[PDB]
Amino acid sequence: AFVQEPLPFDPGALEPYGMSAKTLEFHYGKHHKGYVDNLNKLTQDTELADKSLEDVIRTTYGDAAKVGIFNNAAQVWNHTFFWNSLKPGGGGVPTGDVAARINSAFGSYDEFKAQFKNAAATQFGSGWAWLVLEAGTLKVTKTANAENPLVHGQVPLLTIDVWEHAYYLDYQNRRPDFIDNFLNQLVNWDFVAKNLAA
Amino acid sequence: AFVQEPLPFDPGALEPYGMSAKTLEFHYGKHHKGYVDNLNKLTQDTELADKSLEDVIRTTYGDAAKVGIFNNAAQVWNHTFFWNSLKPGGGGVPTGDVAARINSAFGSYDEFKAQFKNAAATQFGSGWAWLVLEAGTLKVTKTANAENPLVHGQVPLLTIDVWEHAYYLDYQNRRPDFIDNFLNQLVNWDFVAKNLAA
Ligand SMILES: [Fe+3]
Ligand SMILES: [Fe+3]
């Protein structure tokens, strides 16, 4: 069946960098695994058992009869993408082709950071902010709930989860501080670069 | 300006009943006050400064230029309605006209509890569940983000907040347990009866 991808680092390894071991216990151990479980419950009898996360997402998006499958598949994919977007001793500025394309779409890295932070801060309710490639240019986006750039004809490059469970144990109501900490200590530009190259 | 309605009980008084003092500190002290502060920022300039929350909510519903005012006013109203939906030593069964009308619509109080819990448990993302009166009968509804029954031509009687901040410090991912705790130890049937009689 669908299997939860292992975390790309030890679950306590982000604690010096602003994301607690307790957060990883609940967010990866309970929320993310829960989405895998519900995805499996709703697909293992069906034609979608044989299908990639991405294909399940794109197939079931917009289908009023398959909202459960969509929401779970999208969340499974989103919270693998999110863990890959983090690393112990992240932060710093992007280099190489990523940095060049950020400068050309946003003017500078700082101007990207402001737009990315605004997106993440202003998604009202539960959701995600993203760096994406669309029509050969980089863009910052925000999505609601389980939505994700795959359903908007975009290539995802980076995400931050702004569902309250992502940050509430460590920042409570302080989403903006959570977002700053992500940019300052956790963002994984190596992942972004791999995504852009492909 | 708009003033945050005082909590109807001491902020530590729900602790033996499944809602911690810490939760009240953050939820009432920070989240709720924040919405008031934002509502005041966006309205004290204007025509809407003297309006009841209910009137701001109905007036700005659907207005593409006033989403911020809508969301904040709706959340100020929703939180106040939530605190009133709670009491120390709540729970038990409704009586009187509330009970008769629940029996008429749901068949029994236990069936209401099932329907209410289902609604609260399945609102995906951030939102609220409600008992409402509409077209002479009771029903359960759920809403997203800041929406509430006032913009659906329904009279709200009871609510539970299912934004993750409402429960995450006390139950983490365990929303179903949070909802059971509300029904068993917190729901304020007196408030429901007041709302119904009006
Ligand atoms: Fe998450
Ligand atoms: Fe709330």
Task: Give the residue extent of every domain in chain B.
Answer: 1-198
* Entry resolution (Å): 1.6
Ligand 1 mean position, distance from CA A177 (Å): 17
Both tokens assigned to B138 = 């009771």
* Amino acid symbol at B146: A
Instruction: Give B4's contacts (C-beta < 8 A, 6+ positions apart).
Output: B32, B33, B36, B76
Q: Looking at this protein, which amino acid is placed at residue B121?
A: A
Characterize the bridge pairing of strands A127-134 and A155-161.
antiparallel
- Residues of chain A positioned with their CB less than 8 A from the CB of B29: none
Residue A154: C-alpha distances to residues A33, A53, A133, A138, A189 (Å): 26, 16, 6, 10, 19
Judging contacts by C-beta atoms under 8 Å, the chain A residues touching residue B145 are 124-125
* CA–CA gap between residue A163 and residue B125 (Å, rounded): 8
- CA-nearest residue to A22 within chain B is B172
Among the listed residues A37, A41, A53, A29, the one whose alpha carbon sits nearest the alpha carbon of residue A165: A29
Method: X-ray
Residue A167 Cα to ligand 1 midpoint, Å, equals 9
Measured in degrees and rounded to the nearest 5, phi and psi for residue B17 equal: -110, 20
Coil, strand, or helix at residue A60?
helix
Phi and psi at B105, nearest 5°, equal -90, -45
C-alpha span between A57 and A38 (Å, rounded): 14
- Residues whose CB falls within 8 Å of the CB of residue B80, separated by 6 or more in sequence, listed in order: B5, B32, B53
Residue A197 sits at φ, ψ, to 5 deg, of -60, -30
Helices and strands, number each (H, E), in chain B: 9, 3
Considering every ligand atom shown, identify the ligand nearest to the alpha carbon of residue A82 and give its number.
Answer: 1
Size of interface A-B (CB pairs under 8 A): 53
Interacting residues of A95 by C-beta distance below 8 A, sequence separation 6+: A189
Binding residues of B for Mn(2+): 27, 79, 161, 165
Which residues contact residue A189 at a Cβ distance below 8 angstroms, ignoring those fewer than 6 apart?
Answer: A90, A92, A93, A94, A95, A98
A62: left (phi over 0), alpha (psi -120 to 50) or beta: left
Pairing of the two strands A127-134 and B137-144? unpaired
CB contact under 8 A, B71 and A124: yes
Residue type, A172: Q
Pick B125's closest partner by Cβ from A31, A125, A169.
A125
Question: Per residue, what are the HEC states of B94-151?
Answer: CCHHHHHHHHHHHCCHHHHHHHHHHHHHHCCCCEEEEEEEECCEEEEEEEECCCCHHH
User: Quick one: tokens of B146?
Assistant: 């800041």
C-alpha distances in Å from residue B32, one per residue of A61, A165, B151: 34, 18, 20
Rounded to 10 deg, the angle between the B96-106 and B189-197 helix axes is 90
For residue B118, which residues of chain A lie inside 8 Å, CB to CB? Answer: none
